[PDB]
A paper describes a structure:
Neisseria meningitidis encodes two MarR-family repressors, NMB1853, a homologue of FarR found in N. gonorrhoeae which presumably also controls expression of the FarRAB efflux pump, and a second MarR, NMB1585, of unknown function. The proteins are homodimers comprising a largely helical dimerization domain linked to a DNA-binding domain that contains a winged helix–turn–helix motif. MarR proteins repress the activity of their target genes by binding as dimers to pseudopalindromic sequences in the −10 region of the regulated promoters. The repressor activity of MarR proteins is modulated by co-inducer binding, or in the case of OhrR oxidation of cysteines disrupting disulfide-bridge formation, both of which lead to a major rearrangement in the dimerization region such that the spacing of the DNA-binding domains is significantly altered, preventing DNA recognition.
The structure of NMB1585 was solved to a resolution of 2.1 Å by the multiple-wavelength anomalous dispersion method using seleno­methionine-substituted protein. Overall, the dimeric structure resembles those of other MarR proteins, with each subunit comprising a winged helix–turn–helix (wHtH) domain connected to an α-helical dimerization domain. The dimer interface is thus formed by a symmetrical interaction of the arm domains of the two monomers and involves contacts between both N-terminal and C-­terminal regions (approximately residues 1–25 and 110–142). The spacing of the recognition helices of the wHtH domain indicates that NMB1585 is pre-configured for DNA binding, with a putative inducer pocket that is largely occluded by the side chains of two aromatic residues (Tyr29 and Trp53). Thus, NMB1585 appears to be pre-configured for DNA binding, similar to the structures reported for the HucR regulator of D. radiodurans and a MarR-family protein from S. tokodaii. Overlaying of NMB1585 and MTH313 confirms the presence of a potential ligand-binding pocket in NMB1585 at a similar location to those in MTH313 and other MarR proteins. Therefore, in order for a ligand to bind into the binding pocket of NMB1585 a conformational change would have to occur in the protein so that the dimerization domain moved away from the DNA-binding domain. This may be explained by the occluded nature of the putative binding site observed in the crystal structure of NMB1585 and suggests that the protein may adopt this conformation in solution.
Residue numbers in the entry:
A (entry chain B), B (entry chain A): 1 to 142
Write the structure that this text describes.
Amino acid sequence: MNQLDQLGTRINLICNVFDKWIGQQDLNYNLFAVLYTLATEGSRTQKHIGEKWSLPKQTVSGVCKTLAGQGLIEWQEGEQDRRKRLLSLTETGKAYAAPLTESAQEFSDKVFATFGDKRTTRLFADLDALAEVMEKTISENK
Amino acid sequence: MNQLDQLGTRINLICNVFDKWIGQQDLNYNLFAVLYTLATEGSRTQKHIGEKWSLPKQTVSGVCKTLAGQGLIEWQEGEQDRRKRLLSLTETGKAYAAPLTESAQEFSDKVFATFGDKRTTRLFADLDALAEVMEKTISENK
């Protein structure tokens, strides 16, 4: 079949597999996007989390409501609107995310065993290049 | 930073951008899955479509009900349920699907013209391998 078809089926398969691993961590993709980013990158904005994990603002806002009510995250104080202020894991959040970061590193190590870092850097640059072409072609059509 | 993090963000971006392109045809992933499979492969069961595009059976049946009600698709006749029966584009469905296959083929030629076919093979093989290891590791972790 067509290359686009070959790509589309593949990426959808692999995203589903990644979501399945997240499910094993007793989370969903949306919760993971917030929890994992803050655990690994430190303090980040809702905008950043949403752009990183390709989620709309409302998705991120929703998950942040729930996590903040569970006392797991907090927004840094400031004059800016809440949504623009830096989000951070609380102490309970850090404890809650510790297992997640560990099991992520574990899964990451098994998973990339056959790849070198040279190969993966290139694969990641390939995916980026792929995304760029696709976005640019889409922009043209708009 | 982390390999898994780098992979997860990038596959979800491609998946997103693919969905965005589909949306620019004024469709969605679920409809595309049925319409595009049928237009390019011919007759297929709901199961084949569901497996190819990584969609649950309920989702597929729902979309098929809508398209049949619009006279765009049809089940062949037989002494089994329609869900295990061959799905076909009607005449009105083929005219309906024509512009979609054309824009898909146009998108595919524009994207992969930049990406290159040896590099496309490399991306596919790497994604295949990653998906393989990930599935196997998740299976073990149960």
